[PDB]
Structure 1
C-alpha cells in the first residue's frame, strides 16, 4: 500500500546464494540491517509485508521463520498452502500485490519488501512505476549458483544518500561491504 522495495546482498561477481545459503560466511550486522529495514513501518499500527520465493523461505533457518513483526508471503505455483510458519501464499507477483488491496489487509500494510530470490527480483524490477532497490555490495568475489539480475543504470539512479543507511564501508569477518539505494520511477 505504501512503497514497493527490493532488498538483497550481492557479491562483486553478482552472486546471492550457493546451495541454499548465502555464498559468504554470515554477516551478523548485515542481517541486523536487513531486519531493521524490512521491519520498520513509517506509520503507527501498520506492518510491513515481505514477499519471497519458496527457496528463499526454506533457506532461512527455522529459528528465524517466520520473520518476526512482518506479514510473511511465499510465492509458489506448486504449494497448495503456505509453508509452516508462513502467513500467505500467492501464485504470482501480481496476485501478491492485488491482495495488499484486499480490505482484509486493507489498512494493515505499510511498505512491501521483495526479499528474494532471483526470479522474484527480476519480475519486481520490470514492474513499472516507482521502486527502490536496497543493495548491500559485498566487496569480493564468491563462488555462487544464483545471481542477482543486471541493474539498468539507464533506469535506476544510485542515490547519494538515504536516511538510516550508513554511507561508509563496513567490515565484518574480514570482508568489506557497503549499502546502496537505487531509485526508479517509469
Structure 2
C-alpha cells in the first residue's frame, strides 16, 4: 500500500459526531460523495478497503452494514473477532495495512480509505508516506461530542482544486459546505 486516504465531514467547531450519529441533519449529496469516493476502485476485480473504529461501525445503520461494494475492516483492541457483518478485524492501523498484503487480500484491494472516528484519523494522519485527506467543511457550528484533530500545515497542503472534487460552496437543506482536499507526500 503506497497511499492512504482519509475522508471526514466536520463542523466549524471541529465536530464530527454527537450521540453516536452525525451532529447535523442528513445531507444526501454529501453522503453520495462519501459513497463515491470510498467505493470507486480504479481496478476492475478489486474493491477499496474501508477502515473504521468500533463506534463508527455501530453508528452505521445495521441494514447498511457492511458498506456495500467495499471491504469493511474494524479496528478494536478489545474485540477478539470482527463484529457481525464486518469482513476483518485488526488491533491497529499497522496491522490492518499488513493484512492487505497477506494471501486472503493480496490482489483484492485497490485504495484504502480511513472513515473515522477521531483516534483512527489521528493515527492515519501521522502514518508515513503519501496521504490525502478529503475534508468536508460544514460551515456552521453544531453541538458535538466527537471531534476532528486539527490539520498540521507543516505536513499537509490544502490543494486549491482537485480533479473529481467540486470547488464551489455547496448547499443542502440550508447548510453550506465545501469539499477540501489536503495532501502530504512523506
- After TM superposition, the score normalised by the length of structure 2 is 0.98
Asked if structure 1 preserves the Cα contact closer than 8 Å seen for 2:3 and 2:129, the reply is: no
Residues of 1 paired with 2:63 and 2:173: CA distance? Answer: 23
Deviation at 1:2, TM superposition (A): 5.2
Shift of 1:156: 0.4
Shift of 1:43: 1.3
Q: 8 Å contact 1:169–1:176 — kept in the other structure?
A: yes
In 2: Cα distance, 1:25 partner to 1:64 partner: 18
The alpha-carbon deviation at position 37 of structure 1 amounts to: 0.4
Conserved 8 A contact 2:2-2:130:
no
**1:75 CA drift (Å):** 0.4
**Displaced runs of 4 or more, over 4 A:** none
Cα 1:26–1:176 change in 2 (3 A) is same
Shift of 1:178: 0.5
Aligned-pair Cα RMSD in Å: 0.9
In the alignment, structure 1 segments of 5+ residues that lack a partner are: none
Structure 2: unaligned runs, 5 residues or longer: none
Separation of aligned partners in 2, 1:140 and 1:153:
22
Q: Distance in 1 between matches of 2:29 and 2:2?
A: 26
2:96 counterpart SS class: helix
Separation in structure 1 between the aligned mates of residue 158 and residue 103 of structure 2, nearest angstrom: 35
Provide the rounded CA distance (Å) in 2 between the counterparts of 1:121 and 1:37.
17
Q: How far does residue 103 in structure 1 lie from its aligned partner after superposition?
A: 2.4
Q: Would you say how many aligned residue pairs link Structure 1 and Structure 2?
A: 186
Which residue in 2 is equivalent to 1:94?
A: 94
Distance, in Å, in 2 between the alignment partners of 1:2 and 1:108 is 15
Match for residue 80 of structure 2? 80
